[PDB]
């Protein structure tokens, strides 16, 4: 198997562990671990173009959008390689992630490997908000916590 | 071209960013920038294997050692891929890094990509130290900042 983690970081209290796991180079990703810090609910959780933190997660691009499609949820087809939805924090303030995408790969020269990932300010909108905005970033707001995507054993 | 961006932070003041810039697939990767909160002299300055900064550097494993030989310096035939010798901070503390390296690469199946860029507290000795520890580590002491190497625009 092959395997993946990001820690993530910002100016704000967020922060948390993500693993991606890859049993077989053609099989799903599983996504998972731990965010603290973050308000209930809904929150936008996305793999962005560049692992460059340099700015903070600002320098991160826009969403990993290799194919050139436009965002969408990750139950979509027309969607970014990087849309994996919402995590949802309980209210303590904590996402227990548990994702599972097709899409995402560790490896191939569309791999999440050296990219980031970032975590939300609000709900992205899965596409469905009616205006151009929802399908570029789904409305998520700001990027409270991000994480460069390094190879794990 | 191919570019990549490690920005190092750690437990202490010592922080930086280095870029990456490789031309062609097959050619040198150039490696510039700047580390701050050294002390004057040389200090080691590696890949190490994994981008795994959950427990900061300490996570990042051994040196990125693909093809199984000993430590060395950069320009030494043995050494691992991931050795890239020592850098200079000056008496304030800072290290103007500029090196050329035909041995890592940000593509391929043995790219550094999202795997960690690690200052260390002393000088690398290259593998010439004539010790066990020369020929796996080069003497250069603990990780005083590190950083997942991640894609760039
Ligand atoms: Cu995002
Ligand atoms: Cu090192
Ligand atoms: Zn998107
Ligand atoms: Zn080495």
Chains 1, 2 share one sequence.
Do not use: C, M, Y
């Amino acid at each position: 198997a092959t395997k993946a983690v990001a820690v993530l970081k910002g100016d704000g209290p967020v922060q948390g562990i993500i693993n991606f796991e890859q049993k077989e180079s053609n099989g799903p990703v599983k996504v998972w671990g731990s965010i603290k810090g973050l308000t209930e609910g809904l929150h936008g959780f996305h793999v962005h173009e560049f692992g460059d933190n340099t700015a903070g997660a600002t320098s991160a691009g826009p969403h990993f959008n290799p194919l050139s499609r436009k965002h969408g949820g990750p139950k979509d087809e027309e969607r970014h390689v990087g849309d994996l939805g919402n995590v949802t924090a309980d209210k303590d303030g904590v996402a227990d992630v548990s994702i599972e995408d097709s899409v995402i790969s560790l490896s191939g020269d569309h791999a999440i490997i050296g990219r980031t990932l970032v975590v939300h300010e609000k709900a992205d909108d899965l596409g469905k908000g009616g205006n151009e905005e929802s399908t570029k970033t789904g409305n998520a707001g700001s990027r409270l916590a991000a994480g460069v995507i390094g190879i794990a054993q």
